[PDB]
Amino acid sequence: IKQGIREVILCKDQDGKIGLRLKSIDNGIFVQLVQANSPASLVGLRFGDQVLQINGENCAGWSSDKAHKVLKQAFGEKITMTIRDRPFERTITMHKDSTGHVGFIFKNGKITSIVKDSSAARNGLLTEHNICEINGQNVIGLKDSQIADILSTSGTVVTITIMPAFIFEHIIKRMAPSIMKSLMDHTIPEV
Ligand SMILES: O=C(Nc1ccccc1)C1CC1
């Protein structure tokens, strides 16, 4: 989670798409879905990003519908967005013990127990937080076995990005869980 705003230049693909769905949250606008292999994923837009501006116009108080109408109405040449980094999220770094544990329990993305003497404990990991990202990779919609797989496959150091469930549940509403499994971008970024 970087401090401060950045700017991104987007460009519609052949099909006039950018691979984004936006959601109005507390009078701002937030990224709900990034489509795999899209302009939005190429430029490094991420779930939970706040969009301040589109083409220099402020986003404050827009409908989802309004934000999506703008992205459509804009010319494809150059869409500039002003983006604040995943403001509802926090990243926590942990280290696995020799038994390959960082020391929490989760169910459906949502952390539900911290284990005594664990790294998760030492690091102050919280329950009632949904897991958004593991080691820079979005894992929203993946099944618990697959997250467990990712954590089990990771090195010693594990980096987790997490969002308070109540905010997480507000963002993902109006999106059926198979889009999230099948469509949300779950790839390591390109270089
Ligand atoms: O940062 C957040 N939660 C959190 C904080 C500390 C440890 C673990 C999680 C919420 C505001 C976005």
Swiss-Prot record:
Its main location: other. Induction: By IFNG/IFN-gamma in melanoma cells. Changing K107A: Disruption of the cooperative binding of C-terminal peptides from FZD7 and phosphatidylinositol-4,5-bisphosphate. It is a peripheral membrane protein. GO terms for molecular function: cytoskeletal anchor activity; frizzled binding; identical protein binding; interleukin-5 receptor binding; phosphatidylinositol-4,5-bisphosphate binding; protein heterodimerization activity; protein sequestering activity; syndecan binding. Expressed in lung cancers, including adenocarcinoma, squamous cell carcinoma and small-cell carcinoma (at protein level). Widely expressed. Expressed in fetal kidney, liver, lung and brain. In adult highest expression in heart and placenta. It comes from the Eukaryota. The keyword Iron-sulfur does not apply. Multifunctional adapter protein involved in diverse array of functions including trafficking of transmembrane proteins, neuro and immunomodulation, exosome biogenesis, and tumorigenesis. Positively regulates TGFB1-mediated SMAD2/3 activation and TGFB1-induced epithelial-to-mesenchymal transition (EMT) and cell migration in various cell types. May increase TGFB1 signaling by enhancing cell-surface expression of TGFR1 by preventing the interaction between TGFR1 and CAV1 and subsequent CAV1-dependent internalization and degradation of TGFR1. This is Syntenin-1. The chain holds residues 108 to 298 of 298 of the full protein.
